[PDB]
């Protein structure tokens, strides 16, 4: 009983959600600019900043809500579309349906909107992680730097255009557009003094990766004078060009999604960056490298052996997981966990368009929520005890017990109890790897799920237990409602997304 109404519902919702967000951003920006002369906080009760804050929060939430309904529409649409071509067995008829255009708004950037499952998963992750991160940045924004309240709406708009285009050039441009806001946030909002050099490291590594990706994109564009993913079906690349392109895109996207030899920038940036932006960087930003690579991996025929890339990813996993024991800073430990699971996800895209991509797609969201939760816990500890080092804080239980309980439950979920999506993603990827490489699968499993887990658990257990004897005059209070609800929502999302529709994945 699928008809045209659902098709047009899905398309209209996809386009109109973007225009909703854009009009919110434009109105709030106009109000901010034209209300005062200098555009800085007035430090009184009637500051425009207040309104702006609410506006931004409002919009994201509302857009997310619309997105959810929008997302559901797509699912049904996609499902039935497949059916409409699976059951067309008569040789005389063919599915020839041509749609119209909405008469209210123009197509942004003169392009036709096309969407896929992994793009909408990325958009949902952007929505949720941006909401959490902007909630975790209230205290950092103050006199003379309130403008960066607008950063996450800009991120949402850019990622929307990124995921809703079949233009490979606009794809690359939207991928490139994400650097300036990130650098500005690290430069102007971070409180630590060491963050000035960390931003430079972030910029230089990420831009080297972007330069490699740019070389590959220029290669593809010049050889095939086209900007559509479809036209690549009618042009063949020789062995040399295919090898050059695959190496360039792998290295360039592995600079951002940190492969083994390039994670120094990520470690420094997480150690020095503000907590909210750290949540955004681990939860969502690195995933932008997985998406683009996937697209460029799937549109080209490559006739090379993926053993070198698989070995690089596995070396990343082993190197990151072996370094967890000797970490006393909790934020660095969370960064290393992020590195190991990012490399695990990046491994799943080393077999092309095979069924290995489903585990990677699910584990991207799994890591997004796990990293958001871990960095939020680190932020709570840092704001409570004014430190994030095991040698300075322990016995988080017995004083503010809710934080300790959250730490222990986070450890359980990271260990991967069979009731959540971490176990599902591990099962997918490890089944495929065991069939593809048994000894490699065993080695990777032992290194990741035992040694790294033991180091992680030692560093986190020692902080939770003990006696907080040092400074009783300055000991803090327990969690607030905001932090409790954020942690509970992360747990709930993991457990309940273990129940998503099986048509996908």
């Amino acid at each position: 009983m699928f008809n045209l109404n659902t098709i047009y519902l899905s398309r209209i919702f996809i386009e109109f959600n973007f225009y909703f967000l854009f009009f919110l951003f434009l109105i709030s920006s106009i109000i901010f600019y034209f209300s005062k002369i200098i555009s800085i906080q007035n430090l009184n009760q009637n500051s425009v900043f207040n309104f702006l804050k609410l506006a931004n929060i409002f919009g994201i939430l509302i857009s997310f809500f619309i997105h959810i309904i929008s997302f559901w529409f797509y699912c049904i649409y996609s499902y039935n579309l497949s059916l409409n071509i699976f059951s067309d067995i008569n040789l005389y008829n063919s599915n020839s349906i041509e749609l119209l255009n909405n008469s209210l708004l123009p197509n942004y950037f003169k392009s036709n909107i096309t969407i896929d499952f992994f793009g909408l998963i990325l958009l949902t992750l952007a929505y949720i992680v941006g909401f959490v991160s902007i909630l975790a940045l209230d205290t950092r924004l103050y006199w003379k730097n309130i403008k960066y309240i607008f950063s996450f709406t800009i991120f949402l708009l850019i990622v929307y255009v990124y995921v809703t285009v079949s233009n490979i050039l606009l794809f690359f441009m939207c991928y490139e557009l994400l650097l300036i806001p990130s650098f500005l946030i690290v430069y102007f909002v971070s409180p630590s003094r060491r963050a000035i050099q960390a931003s430079l490291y972030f910029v230089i590594w990420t831009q080297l990766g972007s330069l490699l990706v740019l070389i590959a994109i220029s290669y593809i564009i010049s050889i095939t004078n086209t900007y559509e993913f479809n036209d690549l079906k009618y042009f063949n690349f020789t062995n040399s060009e295919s090898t050059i392109i695959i190496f360039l895109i792998f290295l360039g996207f592995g600079f951002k999604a940190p492969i083994w030899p390039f994670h120094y920038w990520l470690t420094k940036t997480h150690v020095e960056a503000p907590s909210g932006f750290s949540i955004y960087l681990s939860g969502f930003l690195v995933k932008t490298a997985l998406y683009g690579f996937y697209k460029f991996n799937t549109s080209i025929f490559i006739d090379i052996d993926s053993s070198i890339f698989i070995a690089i990813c596995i070396m990343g996993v082993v190197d990151s997981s072996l370094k967890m024991w000797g970490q006393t800073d909790l934020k660095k430990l969370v960064a290393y966990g992020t590195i190991q699971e990012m490399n695990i996800i990046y491994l799943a895209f080393c077999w092309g368009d095979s069924c290995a991509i489903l585990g990677g797609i699910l584990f991207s969201a799994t890591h997004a929520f796990l990293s958001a939760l871990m960095f939020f816990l680190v932020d709570c500890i840092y704001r409570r005890y004014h430190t994030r080092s095991l040698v300075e804080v322990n016995g988080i239980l017995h004083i503010t017990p809710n934080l300790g309980l959250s730490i222990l439950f986070m450890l359980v979920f990271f260990s991967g109890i069979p009731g959540t999506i971490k176990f599902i993603s591990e099962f997918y990827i490890f089944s495929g790897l065991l069939e593809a490489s048994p000894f490699i699968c065993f080695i990777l499993m032992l290194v990741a799920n035992v040694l790294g887990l033991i180091g992680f658990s030692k560093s986190w257990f020692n902080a939770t237990f003990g006696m907080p004897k040092k400074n009783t005059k300055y000991l803090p209070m327990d969690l607030s409602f905001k932090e409790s609800y954020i942690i509970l929502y992360c747990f709930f999302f993991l457990f309940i997304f273990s129940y998503f529709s099986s048509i996908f994945f």
Binding site: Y33, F34, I37, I38, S39
Partner: protein, 101 residues
Amino acid sequence: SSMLIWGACFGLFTRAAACKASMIPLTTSPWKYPKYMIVSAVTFYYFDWYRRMALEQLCYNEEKLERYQIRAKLQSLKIGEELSDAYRESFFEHAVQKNNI
């Protein structure tokens, strides 16, 4: 959209941005607001005409550049290729048929 209105909108926001950047209040020197829109509207309106008129001459130029490329290719042939059967007929067409002057 109209280029005249787009230019007028450009001048309006340019003046307000200049007032903010100089830390002078808005509503200061108000007569500059209509002047900026008038100047900016005429400026971008002429550019719209010039860019369209440059495409026309560029397209007509490529017709002449079409002829130059063919003759440059024949003159850049390596020696011994002029009478080769791959280029012999095309070379003779320009040397003989195009001797119409």
